[PDB]
């Protein structure tokens, strides 16, 4: 499955003027555009090669989109402060996340668009793309405003059509890197925890996309409780890393097997040291 | 492409 995601963050700084705005765009797990309002020269910057060959007028238009959204967000900050009637000397964060997930039939599978204030869910567009979900009472005010102003129709128009067109275009323009899957290179290591105890660590590197599943099974027992996991981390070259460890008694190492599941691998792999 | 159709406001 493929998808396109957009993340906006507006951090309000009081006493130093206008808030800082940062916008990033992800196709699946590769970044392609990012814009910063506090940069030396505020303009849309490409981080993926397949958008770098895009026309300059496209970059101008995208920069205008982002600048307009920055102004819109500063007003939202002020409006939200007014809604909570909070002091003007406090910093506040507003986050916006929207994207669309393509289905297996080459058409829209789902879309999402939601806002959050100071790390708390504020409002979310329902899956029907025609109603809203307000978390608290102040979000009901925005629900009123947008239901009366019919913003849901605008958002659905963006999610059902143009986002899919953009996604397909980007996929075709960069199918060599966005449609490819790098199978993870894996290996298992061990270290001594004690004289009669030892830690086994399954490692997986160089895979795309980030989604992967590592599990430890004891002769058929897949218990996560003793397993130690870490968040999947990027290597910095477009590929991600992940490892999973378990502490075992020496001599019972032969009964344990790591299991790795990933798109790049045709069949799930079983590993042992 | 970004979602720059209307004024999202709040």
């Amino acid at each position, epitope marked *: 499955s493929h998808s396109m995601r957009y993340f906006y963050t507006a951090v309000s700084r009081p006493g130093r003027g206008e808030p800082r705005f940062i916008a990033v765009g992800y196709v699946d797990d590769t970044q392609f555009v990012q814009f910063d309002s506090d940069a030396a020269s505020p303009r849309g910057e490409p981080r993926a090669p397949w958008v770098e060959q895009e026309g300059p007028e*496209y970059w101008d*238009r995208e920069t*205008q989109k982002y*600048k*307009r959204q920055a102004q819109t967000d500063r007003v939202s900050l002020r409006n939200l402060r007014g809604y909570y009637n909070q002091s003007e000397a406090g910093s506040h964060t507003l986050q916006r996340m929207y994207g669309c997930d393509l289905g297996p039939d080459g058409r829209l599978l789902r879309g999402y668009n939601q806002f959050a204030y100071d790390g708390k869910d504020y409002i979310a567009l329902n899956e029907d793309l025609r109603s809203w979900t307000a978390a608290d009472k102040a979000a009901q005010i925005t629900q009123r405003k947008w239901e009366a102003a*019919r913003e849901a*129709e*605008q958002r*659905r*128009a*963006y999610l*059902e*059509g*143009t986002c899919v067109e953009w996604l397909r275009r980007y996929l075709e323009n960069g199918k060599k890197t966005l449609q490819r899957a790098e199978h993870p290179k894996t290996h298992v290591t061990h270290h001594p925890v004690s004289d009669h105890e030892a830690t086994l660590r399954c490692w997986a590197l160089g895979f795309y996309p980030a989604e992967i599943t590592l599990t430890w099974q004891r002769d058929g027992e897949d218990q996560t409780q003793d397993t130690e996991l870490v968040e999947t981390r990027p290597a910095g070259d477009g590929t991600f890393q992940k490892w999973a460890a378990v502490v075992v008694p020496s001599g019972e190492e032969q009964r344990y097997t790591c299991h790795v599941q990933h798109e790049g691998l045709p069949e799930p792999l079983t590993l042992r040291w | *492409g970004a979602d*720059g*159709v*209307g*004024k999202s406001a709040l």
Partner: T-cell receptor
Framework: EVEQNSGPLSVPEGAIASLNCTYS??????FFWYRQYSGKSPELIMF????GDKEDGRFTAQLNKASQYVSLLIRDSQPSDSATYLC???????????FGSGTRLLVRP | GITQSPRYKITETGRQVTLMCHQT?????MFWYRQDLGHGLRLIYY???????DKGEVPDGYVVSRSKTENFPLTLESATRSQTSVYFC??????????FGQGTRLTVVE
């Protein structure tokens, strides 16, 4: 480029009156219908961005988007409603909004 | 709201004329339009935000500038017989409904 139903129409008894517009640049995603009285500035009545039809009191509209025939129409007519009706569409990139040739509508009471 | 400065104006051929347009909604987009009933209502120039001006379907013989975000003046360097029409100045957000003022009735005579 947008081509509206420029040929004028006049439907005397209150009844359904229908008018559509076609565009040649399939990339729009933004559509609207304006009404202008003789010598006054036009006024919006309907806006549409989604293929599904929309209702509005005495008015309705729909966008096939493959056919790309935008349709606005009125449930019942009155002499006051007779005016020039303009079709408008905005490209999703430049956001330039272009109107079509106005369709004059005259009622006969 | 929105206001067009000259409701009616009459000028000789060869003399430049300027039409002022002002808006209070602080809309990002502003456009100029000509209507004379020949083709309906066509576009001239359209500006997005400020200090950005792009052309339209009938841009020849017209000059514009965008110094302020709320003012979009239209200038005609050499008035001609063809330029006689009814000009409208509209303003809106990118995809929202467009708002224009009362309109400017302009006639150029020999």
């Amino acid at each position: 480029e947008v081509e509206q139903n420029s040929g004028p129409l006049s439907v005397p008894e209150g009844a359904i009156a229908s008018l559509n517009c076609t565009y040649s640049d399939r990339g729009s995603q933004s559509f609207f219908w304006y009404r202008q009285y003789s010598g006054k500035s036009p006024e919006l009545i309907m806006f549409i961005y989604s293929n599904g039809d929309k209702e509005d009191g005495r008015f309705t509209a729909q966008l096939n988007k493959a056919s790309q025939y935008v349709s606005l129409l009125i449930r019942d007519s009155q002499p006051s409603d007779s005016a020039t009706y303009l079709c408008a569409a905005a490209m999703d990139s430049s956001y330039k909004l272009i109107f079509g040739s106005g369709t004059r509508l005259l009622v006969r009471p | 709201g929105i206001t067009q400065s000259p409701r009616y104006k009459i000028t000789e051929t060869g003399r430049q004329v300027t039409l002022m347009c002002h808006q209070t909604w602080s809309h990002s987009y502003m456009f100029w339009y000509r209507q004379d009933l020949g083709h309906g209502l066509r576009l001239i120039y359209y500006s997005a935000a400020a200090d950005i001006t792009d052309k339209g379907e009938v841009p020849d013989g017209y000059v514009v500038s965008r110094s302020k975000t709320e003012n979009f003046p239209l200038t005609l360097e050499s008035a001609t017989r063809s330029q006689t029409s009814v000009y409208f100045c509209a303003s809106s957000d990118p995809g929202t409904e467009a708002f224009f003022g009362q309109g400017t009735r302009l006639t150029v005579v020999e």
